[PDB]
Design a protein around this ligand. Sequence first.
Ligand SMILES: *[C@@H]1O[C@H](CO)[C@@H](O[C@@H]2O[C@H](CO)[C@@H](O)[C@H](O)[C@H]2NC(C)=O)[C@H](O)[C@H]1NC(C)=O
Ligand SMILES: *[C@@H]1O[C@H](CO)[C@@H](O)[C@H](O)[C@H]1NC(C)=O
Ligand SMILES: *[C@@H]1O[C@H](CO)[C@@H](O)[C@H](O)[C@H]1NC(C)=O
Ligand SMILES: *[C@@H]1O[C@H](CO)[C@@H](O)[C@H](O)[C@H]1NC(C)=O
Lengths: 50, 49
Amino acid sequence: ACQYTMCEYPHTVCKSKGSIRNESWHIDSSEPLCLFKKNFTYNVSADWLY
Amino acid sequence: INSGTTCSNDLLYSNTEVSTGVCVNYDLYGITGQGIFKEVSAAYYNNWQ
Ligand SMILES: *[C@@H]1O[C@H](CO)[C@@H](O[C@@H]2O[C@H](CO)[C@@H](O)[C@H](O)[C@H]2NC(C)=O)[C@H](O)[C@H]1NC(C)=O
Ligand SMILES: *[C@@H]1O[C@H](CO)[C@@H](O)[C@H](O)[C@H]1NC(C)=O
Ligand SMILES: *[C@@H]1O[C@H](CO)[C@@H](O)[C@H](O)[C@H]1NC(C)=O
Ligand SMILES: *[C@@H]1O[C@H](CO)[C@@H](O)[C@H](O)[C@H]1NC(C)=O
């Protein structure tokens, strides 16, 4: 939860067999003023999440 | 200064001095009160409670 710079065309690219394009949803390479940062986990074999 | 998340101490000791048996003061996890602890073994809490 920070102050990024979103794009007019922001998009994600998967890591298993990624697409043709590059993942570029933001370009903010200057470690912006963050209010929050956390890391969580879940089940890798689950089908539904909430 | 006054920007970010790297803060300072600003607070109390957080001492592991659970003094059961006597009437005490507490500010547990944000909730304040006075009580008497009486230690028991229980198994209903989950790891975010
Ligand atoms: C939370 O997990 C992510 C995922 O691993 C961490 O992001 C990685 O950070 C390292 C160090 O810069 C990079 O080499 C990896 O490429 C990152 N992974 C991804 C998927 O981008 C992140 O550092 C973790 N944060 C905490 C606080 O544990
Ligand atoms: C994707 O990123 C790589 C690494 O910077 C770059 O060489 C490549 O040209 C990019 N893809 C396109 C279509 O520009
Ligand atoms: C949750 O993960 C465990 C081990 O990672 C696995 O045995 C179990 O099948 C998973 N459950 C679901 C619903 O995916
Ligand atoms: C009263 O004092 C005795 C010994 O000082 C102690 O064992 C007992 O728990 C006390 N009662 C209360 C309610 O604190």
